[PDB]
Design a protein around this ligand. Structure first.
Ligand SMILES: Nc1ncnc2c1ncn2[C@@H]1O[C@H](COP(=O)(O)OP(=O)(O)O)[C@@H](OP(=O)(O)O)[C@H]1O
Length: 124
């Protein structure tokens, strides 16, 4: 069964490209990472940094999670990310997304031993 750490990598890690490669990046990625299987996941963020760099965020700035839990951490440095947001014309199973590249600080929730990212909370 897929662990939460493995799910995070599948849903949010894309180290192959250092930025949103094209206007069609999200359309391709949301589908290939199985994020449009059950429904069109409305929003999702991909991180273009090494896995090591992202895991290290778990020992960075401790901040409150959107859900009230306190196991969230904010990256000290900005990181290259791509936000994928479902366009109004998108209709399951024909999910469609707008691809947006940015350099922001990421906030992830971490759990376990080793302490690793399991959820993407926000970017600021
Ligand atoms: N503080 C937190 N806020 C939100 N979710 C958290 C938090 N800490 C851990 N999680 C877990 O982070 C996981 C997030 O998985 P999702 O598939 O919902 O992806 P996403 O939130 O990264 O988009 C959930 O665990 P699961 O593997 O059992 O589904 C969720 O329970």
């Amino acid at each position: 069964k897929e662990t939460a750490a493995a799910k995070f990598e599948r849903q949010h890690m894309d180290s192959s490209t250092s930025a949103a490669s094209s206007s069609n990046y999200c359309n391709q990625m949301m589908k290939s990472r199985n994020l449009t299987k059950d429904r069109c996941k409305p929003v999702n963020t991909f991180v273009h940094e090494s896995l090591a760099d992202v895991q290290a965020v778990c020992s960075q700035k401790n901040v409150a999670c959107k859900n009230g839990q306190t196991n969230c951490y904010q990256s000290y440095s900005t990181m290259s990310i791509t936000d994928c947001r479902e366009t109004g014309s998108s209709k399951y199973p024909n999910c469609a997304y707008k691809t947006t590249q940015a350099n922001k600080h990421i906030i992830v929730a971490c759990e376990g031993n080793p302490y690793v990212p399991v959820h993407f909370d926000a970017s600021v």
